[PDB]
Design an enzyme around this catalytic site. Sequence first.
Site, PDB file in Angstrom:
ATOM      1  CG  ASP A 181      24.319 -15.416 -18.176  1.00 39.42           C
ATOM      2  OD1 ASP A 181      25.497 -15.579 -17.851  1.00 39.42           O
ATOM      3  OD2 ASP A 181      23.562 -16.441 -18.339  1.00 39.42           O
ATOM      4  CB  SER A 241      43.470 -16.442 -13.949  1.00 42.29           C
ATOM      5  OG  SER A 241      44.130 -15.781 -13.015  1.00 42.29           O
TER       6      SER A 241
END
EC number: 3.4.23.22
Length: 330
Positions: A35, A199
């Site tokens: 994770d 992004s």
Amino acid sequence: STGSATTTPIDSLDDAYITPVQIGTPAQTLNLDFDTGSSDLWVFSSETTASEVDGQTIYTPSKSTTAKLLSGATWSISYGDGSSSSGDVYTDTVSVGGLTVTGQAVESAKKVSSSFTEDSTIDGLLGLAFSTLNTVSPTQQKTFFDNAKASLDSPVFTADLGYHAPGTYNFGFIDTTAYTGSITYTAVSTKQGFWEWTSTGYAVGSGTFKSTSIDGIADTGTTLLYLPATVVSAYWAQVSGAKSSSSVGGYVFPCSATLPSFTFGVGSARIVIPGDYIDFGPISTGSSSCFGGIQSSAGIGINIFGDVALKAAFVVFNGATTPTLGFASK
């Protein structure tokens, strides 16, 4: 040194991925959920409340000759999906794919929430976010990667998650055969303890690319792709009959649909998520309403590039002095 381990979807939907991990001496192999959005290595154990264990493999520290109780240490974690766990702490030898750390903090669960109990395939979590998020008290502990880093050939790990198929976590090297083209690196902020990056935009299907900054985290422990409501609405508007359902808890779509792809930007590069990656199947057994793999982050407080996004890429988690993230197509 290096390590390399195969990671395997837990079910036919790629709801999560499990990776075998050797703990203790002799080794006890547990299948952990790696994770990158958390920083605790915790396991089901011989100390876990018996009624809260249902099929998981447990770590029994009393059977490990290298286990040592970390005196006075406790841990307690709550995850973004509402699940939680807590317990005490041992140090022990932990190996992943041939890479060994001695003195790793292994957090032994005394209590786990129902969603953990109900998932027989996940024996615990191995956190790969920054150690500043580790919950051990009163002395915070380091992640497996943090402990291994100085010994690694290069201070990196890579995630290569498969679509409906196994993939690979590598530590200490970049497998140049595992991706196509080049890896595009992008800046990371560690201010919130995550692999947080921005992004450069998105496209829906064959549509034009929209240049827009989307801050979010690369999180292998989250199944879906969670993005701003504007982006998500633009995606589902291209699927006839798709709608946001408050009763179901997100966007659903007719299972008869053909889903468009979703592209996200990494600098000037583009990662394409095929439409099929965005199908999470019937909302309940036998239903013709299917659950979407792109959902709104509104009210999470952060955008999350979870498995839906990451499995479309070869992803480099670069733990150099100034960390960065790399993405390649594959």
